[PDB]
Ligand binder design. Structure first.
Ligand SMILES: CCCC[C@H](O)CO
Lengths: 293, 293
């Protein structure tokens, strides 16, 4: 049983990594590109980009531990722990060459440590729409003159007593629609069918919990990254962010400038947080061209 | 019926003010002091302080519009709108003499405009444990290096689509225990029995909604107060804040200095947001002494 439909020419498969059964969707030929999703979503956010990339690359899109059809991590949900699973998965398919990495939202949190610790393994890097966990996150405001802020959910999701699971259970589809649309410019791309699919996936009890455990580990991830960031990133890097409602704007590139020597950035007007779906055509073009250099 | 037990020698009654039936508890004799509660609670938070004050004052403790046993406001939930109800209620009992005011949490939001617009009616003022709505509220962080921030709930409660009521309805007792304890230093005073009492009151559907409408009106109150604050407060004022987990600390006094000519402030160590219950002895003493000047 597949939670989401597989594109023609791709296969849905699993690999055991350190005792954890990881789900992924894979297709194409050539050097490896790994695409890593974020919160509220699964591998499927990449389903429009995948067949285009597959003309030039071997493409793998895993479900993050605990999410989609992947088993929860057996170590923990901090960025360093999760990055081990993703790094070892990629290396199963690209043992002798460096691979490319594209990540969105918490996919960034879950890959940054393996990028900085294994720089020779990473040919090119694309990061979109999330802060790397560092002290900058403590400056985002709780409330705005226009209403709810961008990241008040950091506290909601990190709270103890299973606050988020307890309040959201039974209302998973309702909450996810609110959350997605509050962070979107182009809400029309999120059809009832698409929202149904994403909601059913993250509503699995272990997935609903896994979702928030990433946030419960965020402060630990920040502390981890304070040490890791002493080593700058050397590989060619591109950042993308949305310039419309829900987007990170200039923050993405400005933060990345502190981490990478060789970085170019784009802000996409008329697009919010969910770039692969809200602004598929220009986002896909920018990623494809950057990786094809 | 009575949601909370009246202290001996006090009466529970109602007064219609501009078409809205307000509930209050009243006792004692002498000059009038009005005690105004905050979010998650009702007049009952004052029930330990009330007998002591009643030896020297006529004491009234109303339920805020829509909360406890008071009807929702008919105008709106902004600070200026709600303050009219409270000012008129007080002046019914003290038409020819100024009265004293003690306010906690959103009790501050709902009284500040009537204090500034009717300064001669207010003899002495005590404010505790919340910001006066102004530009400073936009500087509070969404997330902290320790975990959930003090006021991330501002965004949760203000969110469109009735997000908060939809998630919290039917889980009111769970939510309130988490909210209260997470804002406390001395959590032990919040017995299951006491939490049962508070939760039953705010679980009334009109009360759960009313609670959040105060936050949906917060930006309006900020705009209102930008004009009002052009006139400084002239009457003797005292601020209190908790110095422990969940408390406002030095912020309370520092903000009040911008608003008042004559102000003294105290931070109570080992006490969080819920001063009358967490630290009844020192808080009650500070209030009684200040008013008895
Ligand atoms: C909305 C910007 C991205 C920040 C985090 O990844 C939120 O889940």
């Amino acid at each position: 049983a597949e939670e989401f439909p597989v594109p023609n020419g791709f296969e849905s498969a699993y690999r055991e990594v350190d005792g954890v059964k990881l789900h992924y969707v894979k297709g194409g030929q050539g050097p490896l590109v790994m695409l890593v999703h974020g919160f509220g979503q699964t591998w499927y956010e990449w389903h429009q980009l995948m067949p285009e990339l597959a003309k030039r690359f071997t493409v793998i899109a895993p479900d993050l531990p605990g999410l989609g059809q992947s088993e929860p991590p057996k170590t923990g949900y901090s960025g360093e722990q999760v990055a081990v699973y993703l790094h070892k998965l990629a290396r199963q398919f690209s043992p002798d060459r460096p691979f490319d990495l594209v990540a969105h939202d918490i996919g960034i949190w879950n890959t940054y440590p393996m990028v900085v610790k294994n720089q020779a393994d990473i040919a090119r890097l694309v990061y979109m729409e999330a802060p790397i966990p560092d002290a900058r996150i403590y400056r985002f405001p709780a409330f705005t003159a226009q209403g709810e802020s961008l990241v008040w959910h950091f506290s909601f999701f990190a709270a103890d007593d299973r606050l988020a699971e307890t309040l959201i259970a039974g209302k998973e589809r309702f909450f996810l629609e609110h959350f997605i649309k509050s962070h979107a410019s182009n809400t029309e791309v999120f059809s009832e069918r698409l929202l149904d699919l994403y909601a059913r996936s993250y509503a699995k009890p272990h997935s609903l919990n896994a979702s928030f455990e990433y946030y419960r580990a965020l402060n630990e991830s920040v502390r981890q990254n304070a040490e890791l960031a002493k080593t700058r990133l050397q590989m060619p890097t591109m950042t993308l962010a949305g310039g419309g409602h829900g987007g990170m704007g200039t923050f993405q590139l400005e933060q990345m400038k502190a981490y990478a020597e060789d970085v170019e950035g784009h802000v996409l007007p008329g697009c919010g947080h969910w770039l692969p779906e809200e602004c598929a055509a220009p986002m896909n073009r920018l990623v494809i061209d950057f990786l094809s250099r």
